[PDB]
């Protein structure tokens with residue numbers, strides 16, 4: 001649900017995700033990573049299922065962050081694909097892909113894969 | 124500059140991707156899939172490096188599509204992560220993650236992974 | 245190390261992994277999954293770095309299980325790629341790919357991706 | 368039966384894969400990579416469906432290579448998961464995970480993902 005997704009979330013690495021879920025299925029906010037070639041906040045944009053199933057299923061969503069802001073440019077972008085599970089302890093479970101720009105030759109080693117779990121902070 | 128990312132692209136499955144790249148890094152557009160539980164167009168939003176390195180490297184980017192529109196709701200979302208290479212034959216080489224909303228018990232098989240290559244041909 | 249890897253391991257889904265690490269970098273054993281179209285034990289084969297780095301790095305390894313035994317055939321195979329971290333609480337952290345045989349047409353949806361963490365049981 | 372998996376295959380990077388498939392599902396052989404921190408041949412072991420479905424589907428399989436041999440030790444291992452399709456032009460279509468041994472702090476960037484297509488050409 002939008003209200004459930006909107007808020008401040010943190011993951012196991014200590015990164016911060018601030019997001020607003022719009023009525024049209026949109027997600028906008030900023031992301032701050034605790035690791036990597038990144039500093040300060042970066043803009044994020046994404047989409048989510050604004051009409052999930054009426055059962056105990058998670059709400060599918062995803063977002064992207066290109067790691068360029070006014071202070072650094074890492075020449076990379078990460079996309080997180082996962083689901084939102086609301087409740088007393090709401091979590092967003094994801095798997096992500098991080099692609100770095102490379103020459104054709106090194107293209108075989110351009111993408112990392114991992115997974116992150118986010119916990120919502122009260123409010 | 125010289126990022127002919129804006130345009131209509133097609134992938135090996137015959138899906139169509141129409142995007143606009145903004146000077147500061149935004150990507151907006153619509154996606155139409157030739158396969159799956161989808162029909163007509165869906166809204167996409169992403170980001171790209173608006174200042175790629177000045178060496179022979181590609182431009183990293185990514186975008187998301189939540190598979191809900193006025194015709195169907197597949198309760199899933201796909202994110203594509205990859206890089207753009209321009210020139211005579213410009214291509215966008217990606218790897219994607221498709222997550223469906225499941226119950227806890229089926230969370231272990233909620234995500235598919237694949238790769239798509241787009242061209243303007 | 246071989247001695248450290250050899251043993252019985254379980255993951256968060258309740259699946260069992262019994263393995264022997266050979267001096268030549270080989271892994272052989274059986275796997276029993278708590279979920280899926282599987283029943284009883286399946287043979288597994290893999291390899292590991294028999295000469296890791298002398299630091300606090302994990303030992304890279306991977307193994308495969310084709311889901312066919314004398315009782316079922318799911319027409320699929322899973323490969324786990326990860327690292328072994330030994331110590332008092334040794335763990336094997338992995339990411340896996342599960343490919344199902346399909347017709348060319350449905351090949352775009354043939355592979356699932358996930359991650360599993362294994363805990364070693366005493367002995 | 369009719370699984371011409373045994374043989375010498377090559378992928379788009381020019382790497383060579385020589386494998387033998389056993390009647391009960393084992394795969395054994397050697398791998399030589401044209402890229403990376405590797406040189407000469409490495410041992411591979413895997414498994415495949417020795418009884419694939421009798422419809423027009425491919426044969427699922429997978430194999431592992433730990434990148435250590437008498438010449439180099441890259442402290443990494445790659446696993447390829449995919450399916451074999453035979454016929455005039457037989458191919459093995461895969462997705463792979465390459466994990467390097469890291470310290471805890473760098474565990475978040477320990478794994479690369481990619482895709483390789485093999486042919487006997």
Ligand SMILES: O=C(O)CCCC[C@@H]1SC[C@@H]2NC(=O)N[C@@H]21
Pocket residue numbers: 011013015032033034035036037038067074076078096098114116475
């Ligand atoms: O190093 C880079 O190229 C940019 C920073 C990447 C940080 C990654 S994105 C996935 C993972 N989750 C995080 O919170 N941070 C890392």
Ligand SMILES: O=C(O)CCCC[C@@H]1SC[C@@H]2NC(=O)N[C@@H]21
Pocket residue numbers: 134136138155156157158159160161190197199201219221237239352
């Ligand atoms: O079935 C669904 O859940 C919605 C359609 C999914 C279509 C996928 S997304 C990745 C791949 N690339 C495409 O162009 N279409 C498929």
Ligand SMILES: O=C(O)CCCC[C@@H]1SC[C@@H]2NC(=O)N[C@@H]21
Pocket residue numbers: 231255257259276277278279280281282311318320322340342358360
């Ligand atoms: O359903 C199938 O095709 C065969 C069983 C798959 C079980 C998978 S493999 C990865 C994950 N980890 C487990 O312990 N079980 C599931």
Ligand SMILES: O=C(O)CCCC[C@@H]1SC[C@@H]2NC(=O)N[C@@H]21
Pocket residue numbers: 108378380382399400401402403404405434441443445463465481483
């Ligand atoms: O650099 C290393 O760690 C060892 C060599 C890795 C080579 C990889 S494995 C996947 C891809 N396919 C190949 O044929 N080679 C690269």
